[PDB]
Amino acid sequence: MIGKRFFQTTSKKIAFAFAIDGVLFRGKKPIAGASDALKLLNRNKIPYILLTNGGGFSERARTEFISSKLDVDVSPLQIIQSHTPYKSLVNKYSRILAVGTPSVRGVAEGYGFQDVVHQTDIVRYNRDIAPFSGLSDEQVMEYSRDIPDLTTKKFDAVLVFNDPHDWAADIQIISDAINSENGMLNTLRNEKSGKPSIPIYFSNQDLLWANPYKLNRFGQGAFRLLVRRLYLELNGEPLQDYTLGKPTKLTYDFAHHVLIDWEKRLSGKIGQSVKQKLPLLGTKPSTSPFHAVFMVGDNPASDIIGAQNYGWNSCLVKTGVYNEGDDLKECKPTLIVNDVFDAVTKTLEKYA
Amino acid sequence: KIAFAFAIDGVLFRGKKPIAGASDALKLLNRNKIPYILLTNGGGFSERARTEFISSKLDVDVSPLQIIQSHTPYKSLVNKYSRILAVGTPSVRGVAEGYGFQDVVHQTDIVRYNRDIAPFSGLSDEQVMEYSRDIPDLTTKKFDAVLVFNDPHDWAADIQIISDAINSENGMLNTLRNEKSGKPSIPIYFSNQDLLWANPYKLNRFGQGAFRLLVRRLYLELNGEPLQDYTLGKPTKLTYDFAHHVLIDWEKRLSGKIGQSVKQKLPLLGTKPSTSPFHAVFMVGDNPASDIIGAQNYGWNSCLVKTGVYNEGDDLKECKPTLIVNDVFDAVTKTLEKYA
Ligand SMILES: O=P(O)(O)OC[C@@H](O)CO
Ligand SMILES: O=P(O)(O)OC[C@@H](O)CO
Ligand SMILES: [Mg+2]
Ligand SMILES: [Mg+2]
Ligand SMILES: [Mg+2]
C-alpha cells in the first residue's frame, strides 16, 4: 500500500469476507468509505465475498442493490446470506414453513423447495390461530396466498430465513408446528420432548445488529431465544434446533467454498458463464489457495468469534454493534479499526 | 351469603361468542339475587365498555362496578408515575387516560416518532396514523414506568421498545445505560401471567404470561440478572384482595346498605379487606394455573370448567378445584345446590 494505490508484493493470495450491516451499510445507506474500500479491491482483483447474516431477498437482488449504492460491481456469486445454505435442504424437506418477511416465499421457491408455506398463509387461513397478529386486511391480501392441502399434508420442517415482522403471530405459528402431531396443522401432541415435532432451522443467532438507529437492535438470535423460551416452558426440555449463519462452522465452510470458486473466476481459471456448483453442507473445501482470509465485521459474537473458530483472521470495526471498550470475551480480533476502509488498507499494508 | 367470581375467556365467552349456558348462568344468579363479580385477566377497554358489551351479548345487566380486568388495579398507580409507557392494544391508551394517568405514551407513538427504533414492526403507515398520537417531548421528558395493560399486537416492536425503556438511562428515550443490573431503569408492571388462554380456536393460545417470559428472557440476556418486575392479575394476592374489596362493595349495593348514586371508592393496592362477609366465594375458571391456584391460595372455593384452557385428563399437578364440571351453568347450579 502507498497512499491510495495498492501494489502486489507477493504471489501469496489474501482475501476478505465482509459483513454488510454495520460494516458497509446502516440500513439502505452506505457507510462512508465502504464504496472506496470495495473499489480498491475490485481495481486490484483481490478476491472477496460478502458474508452476511442479513437476508430476505434473492442473492442477485441483494448484490444488484449493493452494486448500485456503492458504485461498484458485486456479483451475485460473491454473497452468502443467512439463508443461502438452505439451498442445500431442498431435497430433504418437501413442504416447509418458510418464516421471514413475505419476500422469503419467493426466495425459497427460487431455491427449489417443492411446497413453500409462509407464516402469513396460516393467519390468512384462520385469523384466530394468531390472536395478536398485527396484519391489516391490506397486508394479509398482499403477503399471503391460499395454499392447497394446507390442513391435510404434513409440514416437513420450519426454516427461518430472516426476521419476520409480526412476532406474536410468527412465534405462535412456529410453536404450533414444533409441538404438532407429526407436522399436521391444527394438532397438538400429547407427549413432551426436547425433540420438536418437525425440525427447525434458524439462519442467524445474532442477538444484536446495527441498523440506522444509534442503538443496537435485537435480531434473529433474539427471536430464536424467544421461540426457545416458550418451547422449554411447554416441554420442560430445551429445544433441539439447527443453526446456520455466522459464527457456525456450517456457514464458514459453505462461504469458504464460495470464495474459492469466486477466486477461480476472478483469475480467469473459470469462465464467467460457467454455472456455479452448490457446495455440500458439512464439507470443508478440498483445497485452499489463500495465505489468509480476513473477516471484516462489527459483531464480536458473530463475525469475530466465527472467523476465529474457523481459523481466519479478522478485522473488528467500530461502525456497528461493537463500541470501543466493550467486553470482547474470548475474541481476539487480528486488528481493531475505525471502519471498513481502514480495515482493508491496514490489512493490505500489514499482510500484503 | 355465597358469592361467585367468574373468569370470562373460556367460561362465559370464546372470543366474542357467548358459551352455551353462560347467559342462563348469570340470569340464574340475578333472578336469585346472588352477588358475583367478573374477575378476568383479559382487558383492553374501559370497565364500562367491557361490561356494556357483555351485558348486550348475554342479555343480562352487568354493572361496570362488577368487573375487575387485568389492568383495573393500575388505577391505583396514577399518582405514582406521571409519564407511562402504556403497552397493549391501541385502546389501552384511552383506558389509561380515563384512569387519570397524566402523560400516557402508547408504544405505537414511538414507532410514529422513528420507524428505525423497531425494524421488525409490522405496523402499516395507515395503522401508525390510526393507533398513534403526536406526543410532545417524547425525547426530552423521562418515562416513569412501563405498564403492560394487555397483549399488544406487534411484538417485535413492542418487545424492542419495552427493552429500550427498562435498559435506558433513567427512562430517557434514545439512551442506553452503562451498567447491567437486575433492577430495570424504570419499573415495569405486567397485568396477566397466563401462559395460555382459550380464544375461538380449538387449541390454547399464548397469552400475556408468554409475552412476559419473552421480555424477561431478553432482559436476562442483556443484564446477566433476572428482571425485577411487578406482577398483577390472577393468581396474585394483589389482584384477589382487590377483587375481594370490589365483591364486598357490590354486595353492599345489591342489598341496599350503599346507594347506587354513591361513587365507589378505589380500593388502595396491596391492602386486605377489613372484613370477610361471605360464607364462601366460588371462583369459576378454565385455567388451573391462574383461576384455580389463585382462588386456592386466597382461601376461596373454585369450579373448574372444561370449556376453555383445561381438558379432561390434564394433570392438575398442584391445585384442587372444589368442583370440576362441564361448563359455567353446571358450575353455578351444582355449587348452589350443594353449598348455598
Ligand atoms: O452484519 P451482517 O451483514 O452479518 O448482518 C447482520 C444481520 O444480523 C442483520 O439482521
Ligand atoms: O379467563 P380470563 O377472563 O381471566 O381471561 C384470560 C386472559 O388471559 C385473556 O387474555
Ligand atoms: Mg453486522
Ligand atoms: Mg400490521
Ligand atoms: Mg380463561
PDB file of C-alpha atoms in Angstrom, chain A residues 45-160:
ATOM      1  CA  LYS A  45      -8.574  -8.091  -8.443  1.00  0.00           C
ATOM      2  CA  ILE A  46      -8.343  -9.015  -4.775  1.00  0.00           C
ATOM      3  CA  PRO A  47     -10.953 -11.710  -4.081  1.00  0.00           C
ATOM      4  CA  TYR A  48     -13.674 -11.010  -1.537  1.00  0.00           C
ATOM      5  CA  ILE A  49     -17.121 -12.230  -0.608  1.00  0.00           C
ATOM      6  CA  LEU A  50     -19.934 -10.635   1.327  1.00  0.00           C
ATOM      7  CA  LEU A  51     -20.805 -12.953   4.213  1.00  0.00           C
ATOM      8  CA  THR A  52     -23.866 -11.547   5.924  1.00  0.00           C
ATOM      9  CA  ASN A  53     -26.383 -12.803   8.448  1.00  0.00           C
ATOM     10  CA  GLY A  54     -28.920 -10.483   6.739  1.00  0.00           C
ATOM     11  CA  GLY A  55     -31.303 -11.821   4.113  1.00  0.00           C
ATOM     12  CA  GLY A  56     -34.843 -11.638   2.759  1.00  0.00           C
ATOM     13  CA  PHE A  57     -34.295 -11.304  -0.995  1.00  0.00           C
ATOM     14  CA  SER A  58     -32.544 -13.289  -3.671  1.00  0.00           C
ATOM     15  CA  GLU A  59     -28.748 -13.163  -3.857  1.00  0.00           C
ATOM     16  CA  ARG A  60     -28.964 -11.392  -7.253  1.00  0.00           C
ATOM     17  CA  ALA A  61     -31.434  -8.794  -5.993  1.00  0.00           C
ATOM     18  CA  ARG A  62     -29.345  -8.020  -2.935  1.00  0.00           C
ATOM     19  CA  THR A  63     -25.994  -7.724  -4.826  1.00  0.00           C
ATOM     20  CA  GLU A  64     -27.587  -5.592  -7.577  1.00  0.00           C
ATOM     21  CA  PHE A  65     -28.834  -3.199  -4.922  1.00  0.00           C
ATOM     22  CA  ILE A  66     -25.425  -3.109  -3.235  1.00  0.00           C
ATOM     23  CA  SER A  67     -23.653  -2.625  -6.601  1.00  0.00           C
ATOM     24  CA  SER A  68     -25.849   0.387  -7.431  1.00  0.00           C
ATOM     25  CA  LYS A  69     -25.477   2.016  -3.998  1.00  0.00           C
ATOM     26  CA  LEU A  70     -21.684   1.534  -3.764  1.00  0.00           C
ATOM     27  CA  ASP A  71     -20.984   2.246  -7.458  1.00  0.00           C
ATOM     28  CA  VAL A  72     -19.003  -0.998  -7.769  1.00  0.00           C
ATOM     29  CA  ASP A  73     -19.651  -4.339  -9.420  1.00  0.00           C
ATOM     30  CA  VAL A  74     -20.547  -7.055  -6.900  1.00  0.00           C
ATOM     31  CA  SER A  75     -21.532 -10.388  -8.469  1.00  0.00           C
ATOM     32  CA  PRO A  76     -24.399 -12.492  -7.078  1.00  0.00           C
ATOM     33  CA  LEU A  77     -21.695 -15.181  -6.840  1.00  0.00           C
ATOM     34  CA  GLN A  78     -19.918 -13.170  -4.134  1.00  0.00           C
ATOM     35  CA  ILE A  79     -22.640 -13.152  -1.482  1.00  0.00           C
ATOM     36  CA  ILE A  80     -23.673 -15.692   1.207  1.00  0.00           C
ATOM     37  CA  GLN A  81     -26.724 -14.519   3.104  1.00  0.00           C
ATOM     38  CA  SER A  82     -28.074 -16.146   6.254  1.00  0.00           C
ATOM     39  CA  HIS A  83     -30.417 -18.414   4.322  1.00  0.00           C
ATOM     40  CA  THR A  84     -28.218 -19.137   1.277  1.00  0.00           C
ATOM     41  CA  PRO A  85     -27.183 -22.552   2.635  1.00  0.00           C
ATOM     42  CA  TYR A  86     -30.911 -23.525   2.797  1.00  0.00           C
ATOM     43  CA  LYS A  87     -30.432 -24.182  -0.938  1.00  0.00           C
ATOM     44  CA  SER A  88     -28.868 -27.464   0.152  1.00  0.00           C
ATOM     45  CA  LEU A  89     -32.017 -28.564   2.078  1.00  0.00           C
ATOM     46  CA  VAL A  90     -34.337 -28.580  -0.957  1.00  0.00           C
ATOM     47  CA  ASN A  91     -34.258 -32.373  -1.410  1.00  0.00           C
ATOM     48  CA  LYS A  92     -34.715 -33.076   2.296  1.00  0.00           C
ATOM     49  CA  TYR A  93     -37.977 -31.285   3.127  1.00  0.00           C
ATOM     50  CA  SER A  94     -40.949 -31.362   0.727  1.00  0.00           C
ATOM     51  CA  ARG A  95     -43.161 -28.792   2.487  1.00  0.00           C
ATOM     52  CA  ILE A  96     -41.586 -26.082   4.617  1.00  0.00           C
ATOM     53  CA  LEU A  97     -42.935 -23.333   6.762  1.00  0.00           C
ATOM     54  CA  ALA A  98     -40.676 -20.542   5.448  1.00  0.00           C
ATOM     55  CA  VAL A  99     -40.597 -17.901   8.161  1.00  0.00           C
ATOM     56  CA  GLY A 100     -39.492 -14.356   7.451  1.00  0.00           C
ATOM     57  CA  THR A 101     -40.624 -11.232   5.693  1.00  0.00           C
ATOM     58  CA  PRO A 102     -43.057 -12.093   2.846  1.00  0.00           C
ATOM     59  CA  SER A 103     -40.200 -11.840   0.302  1.00  0.00           C
ATOM     60  CA  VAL A 104     -38.784 -15.110   1.708  1.00  0.00           C
ATOM     61  CA  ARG A 105     -41.546 -17.038  -0.045  1.00  0.00           C
ATOM     62  CA  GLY A 106     -40.086 -16.079  -3.435  1.00  0.00           C
ATOM     63  CA  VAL A 107     -36.525 -16.759  -2.222  1.00  0.00           C
ATOM     64  CA  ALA A 108     -37.472 -20.249  -1.035  1.00  0.00           C
ATOM     65  CA  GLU A 109     -39.351 -21.089  -4.223  1.00  0.00           C
ATOM     66  CA  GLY A 110     -36.380 -19.794  -6.187  1.00  0.00           C
ATOM     67  CA  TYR A 111     -34.075 -22.154  -4.298  1.00  0.00           C
ATOM     68  CA  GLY A 112     -36.253 -25.061  -5.447  1.00  0.00           C
ATOM     69  CA  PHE A 113     -38.381 -26.016  -2.426  1.00  0.00           C
ATOM     70  CA  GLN A 114     -41.383 -28.032  -3.591  1.00  0.00           C
ATOM     71  CA  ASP A 115     -44.126 -26.663  -1.332  1.00  0.00           C
ATOM     72  CA  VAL A 116     -43.478 -23.362   0.432  1.00  0.00           C
ATOM     73  CA  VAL A 117     -45.907 -22.040   3.031  1.00  0.00           C
ATOM     74  CA  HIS A 118     -45.293 -18.604   4.556  1.00  0.00           C
ATOM     75  CA  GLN A 119     -46.489 -17.899   8.098  1.00  0.00           C
ATOM     76  CA  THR A 120     -48.965 -15.290   6.836  1.00  0.00           C
ATOM     77  CA  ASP A 121     -50.712 -18.070   4.864  1.00  0.00           C
ATOM     78  CA  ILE A 122     -51.723 -19.647   8.161  1.00  0.00           C
ATOM     79  CA  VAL A 123     -53.031 -16.306   9.536  1.00  0.00           C
ATOM     80  CA  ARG A 124     -54.973 -15.925   6.274  1.00  0.00           C
ATOM     81  CA  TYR A 125     -56.408 -19.444   6.657  1.00  0.00           C
ATOM     82  CA  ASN A 126     -57.639 -18.748  10.224  1.00  0.00           C
ATOM     83  CA  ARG A 127     -57.189 -15.418  11.997  1.00  0.00           C
ATOM     84  CA  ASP A 128     -57.945 -16.999  15.340  1.00  0.00           C
ATOM     85  CA  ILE A 129     -54.720 -19.021  15.164  1.00  0.00           C
ATOM     86  CA  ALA A 130     -52.821 -15.780  15.794  1.00  0.00           C
ATOM     87  CA  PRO A 131     -54.958 -13.600  18.093  1.00  0.00           C
ATOM     88  CA  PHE A 132     -52.186 -10.988  18.433  1.00  0.00           C
ATOM     89  CA  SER A 133     -51.324 -10.650  14.745  1.00  0.00           C
ATOM     90  CA  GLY A 134     -50.960  -7.011  13.669  1.00  0.00           C
ATOM     91  CA  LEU A 135     -51.702  -7.741   9.986  1.00  0.00           C
ATOM     92  CA  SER A 136     -54.176  -5.316   8.476  1.00  0.00           C
ATOM     93  CA  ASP A 137     -56.535  -6.653   5.854  1.00  0.00           C
ATOM     94  CA  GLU A 138     -54.464  -4.986   3.140  1.00  0.00           C
ATOM     95  CA  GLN A 139     -51.334  -6.662   4.500  1.00  0.00           C
ATOM     96  CA  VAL A 140     -52.993 -10.114   4.552  1.00  0.00           C
ATOM     97  CA  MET A 141     -54.082  -9.671   0.896  1.00  0.00           C
ATOM     98  CA  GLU A 142     -50.556  -8.565  -0.222  1.00  0.00           C
ATOM     99  CA  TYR A 143     -48.467 -11.008   1.804  1.00  0.00           C
ATOM    100  CA  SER A 144     -50.414 -14.273   1.882  1.00  0.00           C
ATOM    101  CA  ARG A 145     -51.851 -16.886  -0.501  1.00  0.00           C
ATOM    102  CA  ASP A 146     -54.441 -19.690  -0.363  1.00  0.00           C
ATOM    103  CA  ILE A 147     -52.444 -22.888  -0.065  1.00  0.00           C
ATOM    104  CA  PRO A 148     -53.687 -26.252  -1.420  1.00  0.00           C
ATOM    105  CA  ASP A 149     -53.803 -29.076   1.093  1.00  0.00           C
ATOM    106  CA  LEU A 150     -52.830 -26.653   3.856  1.00  0.00           C
ATOM    107  CA  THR A 151     -54.501 -28.823   6.531  1.00  0.00           C
ATOM    108  CA  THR A 152     -54.150 -32.302   5.005  1.00  0.00           C
ATOM    109  CA  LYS A 153     -50.418 -32.504   4.176  1.00  0.00           C
ATOM    110  CA  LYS A 154     -47.803 -32.527   6.882  1.00  0.00           C
ATOM    111  CA  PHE A 155     -45.207 -29.813   7.212  1.00  0.00           C
ATOM    112  CA  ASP A 156     -41.686 -31.314   6.994  1.00  0.00           C
ATOM    113  CA  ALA A 157     -39.563 -28.506   8.522  1.00  0.00           C
ATOM    114  CA  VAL A 158     -39.632 -24.909   9.812  1.00  0.00           C
ATOM    115  CA  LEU A 159     -36.933 -22.791   8.122  1.00  0.00           C
ATOM    116  CA  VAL A 160     -36.397 -19.286   9.494  1.00  0.00           C
TER     117      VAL A 160
END
